Amino acid sequence: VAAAAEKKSARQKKRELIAKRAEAYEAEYRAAEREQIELARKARAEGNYFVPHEPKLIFVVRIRGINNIPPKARKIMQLLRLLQINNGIFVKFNKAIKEMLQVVEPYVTYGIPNHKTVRELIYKRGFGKVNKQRIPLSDNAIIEAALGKYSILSVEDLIHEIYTVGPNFKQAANFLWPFKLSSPLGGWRERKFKHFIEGGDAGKRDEHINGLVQKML
Amino acid sequence: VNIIKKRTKPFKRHQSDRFKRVGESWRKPRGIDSCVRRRFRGTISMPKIGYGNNKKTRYCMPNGLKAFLVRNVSDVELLLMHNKTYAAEIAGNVSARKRVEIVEKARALGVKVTNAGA
């Protein structure tokens, strides 16, 4: 009766802890979205202009193959872990990253995702790098073993650590394997290898990357 | 568990049909300009490890039994503990008297005989 009993109870209390944590994160998302709406409405009413928020999280998708690519760009591909077409990885949008991206501007597409695409990816296409092995995230215990040092104990905690760009964003990459996405349903645009502004599909695309993922995913 | 064969047609040697000196047995094309070596579209195929069959169903007759060559009564007597896995195969050079002796022994052991009709 014993031994397994205390394990079950500790297992149980951990289950409410992640439940309490998940409640806290969901309230954080909704409050953040609400103040976005309210501070936009207030500024638009009294008259002064509200300004967007410089984003720290973007999603990157490699859209060209492995043939006929300059050595400078394929080197960046290796440093980004984008070693295959239709892959995908997260990168902390900063001056170093932003200036890095224009080098591979025609070879990747990037933009700022919101909470849904992060949640869908991890749940569905989320494969964790456990012991240098692409181990799927089918259990919370898998994430606990590899991120218990950083107090991440479930998928939802990982989703918040990713989506809100926590300090352990760097300490979560090598836990997580690149998103090996499928070819997008409905297709790309007619001419895929032009810049997104020019009627193509490469480059920074912002609010119109969420669309892409839903297809690719 | 059904037995599965990835491929049924054998790999014939290149041009083994336009010549009687070039044989049916497979030989690997060595020529640098061979359109078969470079594996062009429409050309014959080459044996690869990818055609290897399942380890669980490899070496199994269409009825799921592995062949064991049997030359005297002693051999089949050794098959009693694998009547569910191995089917006996009477060797070609076994006399008529020994064949009926082996086949009656194999029937007593209840072990499958593939060519008992001889």
Binding site: R15, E16, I18, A19, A22, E23, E26, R41, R44, A45, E46, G47, E120, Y123, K124, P136, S138, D139, N140, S154, V155, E156 | -
Partner: protein, 51 residues
């Protein structure tokens, strides 16, 4: 362990495994009502309907 990978998005039993929170998540919430406070600044209309 884990012969087959199952999506939480499609298999509801796998959500219950991953989220001990999907039990009560309550997606849709009345935060508007009959009382909508239409609010667009008067000069904002002026600058919008400009040129």
């Amino acid at each position: 362990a884990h012969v087959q990978k199952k999506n939480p998005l499609k298999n509801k039993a796998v959500l219950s495994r991953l989220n001990p929170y999907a039990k009560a998540y309550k997606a849709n919430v009345k935060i508007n009502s009959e009382k909508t406070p239409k609010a667009a600044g008067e000069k904002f209309l002026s600058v919008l309907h400009e040129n």
